[PDB]
Amino acid sequence: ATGYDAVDDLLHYHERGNGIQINGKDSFSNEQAGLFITRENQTWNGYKVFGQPVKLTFSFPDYKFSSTNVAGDTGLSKFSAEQQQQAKLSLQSWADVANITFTEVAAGQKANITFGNYSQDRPGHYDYGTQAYAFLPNTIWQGQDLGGQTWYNVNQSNVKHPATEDYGRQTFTHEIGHALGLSHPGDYNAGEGNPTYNDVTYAEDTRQFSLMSYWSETNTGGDNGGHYAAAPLLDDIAAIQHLYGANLSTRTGDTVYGFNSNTGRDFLSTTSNSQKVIFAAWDAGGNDTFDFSGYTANQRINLNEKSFSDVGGLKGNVSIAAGVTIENAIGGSGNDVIVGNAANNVLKGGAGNDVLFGGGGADELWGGAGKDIFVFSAASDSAPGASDWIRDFQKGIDKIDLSFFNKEANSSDFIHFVDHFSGTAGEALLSYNASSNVTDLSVNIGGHQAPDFLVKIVGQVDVATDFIV
Numbered sequence: 001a002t003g004y005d006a007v008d009d010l011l012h013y014h015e016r017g018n019g020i021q022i023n024g025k026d027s028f029s030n031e032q033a034g035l036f037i038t039r040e041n042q043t044w045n046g047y048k049v050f051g052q053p054v055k056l057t058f059s060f061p062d063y064k065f066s067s068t069n070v071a072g073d074t075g076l077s078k079f080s081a082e083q084q085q086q087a088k089l090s091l092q093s094w095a096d097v098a099n100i101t102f103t104e105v106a107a108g109q110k111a112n113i114t115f116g117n118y119s120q121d122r123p124g125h126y127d128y129g130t131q132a133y134a135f136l137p138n139t140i141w142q143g144q145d146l147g148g149q150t151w152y153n154v155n156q157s158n159v160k161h162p163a164t165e166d167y168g169r170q171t172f173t174h175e176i177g178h179a180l181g182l183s184h185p186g187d188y189n190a191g192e193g194n195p196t197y198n199d200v201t202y203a204e205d206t207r208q209f210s211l212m213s214y215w216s217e218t219n220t221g222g223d224n225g226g227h228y229a230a231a232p233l234l235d236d237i238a239a240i241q242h243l244y245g246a247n248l249s250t251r252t253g254d255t256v257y258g259f260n261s262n263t264g265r266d267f268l269s270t271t272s273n274s275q276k277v278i279f280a281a282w283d284a285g286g287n288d289t290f291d292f293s294g295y296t297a298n299q300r301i302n303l304n305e306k307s308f309s310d311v312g313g314l315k316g317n318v319s320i321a322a323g324v325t326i327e328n329a330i331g332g333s334g335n336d337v338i339v340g341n342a343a344n345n346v347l348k349g350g351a352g353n354d355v356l357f358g359g360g361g362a363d364e365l366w367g368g369a370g371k372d373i374f375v376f377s378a379a380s381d382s383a384p385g386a387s388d389w390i391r392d393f394q395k396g397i398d399k400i401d402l403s404f405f406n407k408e409a410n411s412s413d414f415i416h417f418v419d420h421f422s423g424t425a426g427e428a429l430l431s432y433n434a435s436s437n438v439t440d441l442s443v444n445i446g447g448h449q450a451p452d453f454l455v456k457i458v459g460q461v462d463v464a465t466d467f468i469v
């Protein structure tokens, strides 16, 4: 396959919405999913009151063991230090993406959101079957609002030890989601008490898209390698930003995600090949980098909004929220596909045989070691006055892929190299400056005397060996 083939594949990964069908189910857009996840229309600001900020209190009540909660469970207890630590990280991950402020109050004081353990379904009888539950805002029961109560079965090791068992951390984030107004992404009525993914309302009801889902990411072709996302995923972000607005203050500086991270978030960071990230990135400003340099797997990194990447040997485990511009990407030692966006991007392949695609804007492309391919598919990819730079081209090793153009023209003779321009569309001209070590690649795509495409290349280029046309 050409570099362009790989780029095209990654660009059309997890297409959604616009009425298409997936797995025999309706596909929802990110926006549609956010609305459906919030279909109960309940918020802490009121019924059908959307887009407004909120300040909420939370606490860890000192629940009495022989007490019985509103759901009929007993053997209650206070959250441990470990549970409190992880719950606070889950709270923060919601506050990162929407205009929610969380403030802890004392155990005995009235709080909007509470956390408690249960262990028995009736006195003296331990429950090994259930996991957790919570009540949405404005859930009125016997005249009282249950909204904000969250409850967890501490017999489950993941609930007891969420710092080392990542399903426990996901469960905290999930139940807080309910406490904020999110539902499961379907009611699964057709399942009649024994539901499966076959009972979803829309195809993207999986853990690839929402941690409010219980269905495996594999149902949509994801693969999280046995791990569970700690923090709100792509459609969760749409849902909670619908409810309380997008947080425009978050990570507005120059932010590095992955290796060498300055996020100060465990779920956005890694320090080793074995530590696998799973996240949907929310970022409100600055010049940002997806640094996946420390992974050995073949990776696919897409810097477009709402798009999915294959990172660290997982599939569809990294994504970028709607409205977010991520500028730079760094691949690992594997054979990577790296696709930029309309902004100026710095793309670095690292070792391995990589495919780089800058797209629009003035991009800076580093193949690194290996046999790399730099792909172009529009004049606007590298317009005179905003040219791409390929900063480390090695003749006889790297390649420039212009194959899109002759495929589109259905002609082997559209793109062709000449020693001088004539005005004929398709002409390509190489000009080598041995003094500066820079080669110019100019192409007349649109059919004018002045070329409308100019790539600047550090290094010699051998026309006989270095192109895919």
Ligand SMILES: [Ca+2]
Pocket (backbone or CB within 6 Å): 250, 251, 252, 253, 254, 255, 283, 284, 285, 286, 287, 288
């Ligand atoms: Ca940033």
Ligand SMILES: [Ca+2]
Pocket (backbone or CB within 6 Å): 283, 285, 286, 287, 288, 325, 326, 327
């Ligand atoms: Ca940015």
Ligand SMILES: [Ca+2]
Pocket (backbone or CB within 6 Å): 331, 332, 333, 334, 335, 336, 349, 350, 351, 352, 353, 354
């Ligand atoms: Ca690489």
Ligand SMILES: [Ca+2]
Pocket (backbone or CB within 6 Å): 340, 341, 342, 343, 344, 345, 358, 359, 360, 361, 362, 363
């Ligand atoms: Ca770009």
Ligand SMILES: [Ca+2]
Pocket (backbone or CB within 6 Å): 349, 350, 351, 352, 353, 354, 367, 368, 369, 370, 371, 372
């Ligand atoms: Ca490389």
Ligand SMILES: [Ca+2]
Pocket (backbone or CB within 6 Å): 367, 368, 369, 370, 371, 372, 394, 397, 398
């Ligand atoms: Ca290279």
Ligand SMILES: [Ca+2]
Pocket (backbone or CB within 6 Å): 358, 359, 360, 361, 362, 363, 380, 381, 382, 388
């Ligand atoms: Ca470009």
Ligand SMILES: [Zn+2]
Pocket (backbone or CB within 6 Å): 133, 174, 175, 178, 184
């Ligand atoms: Zn739930």
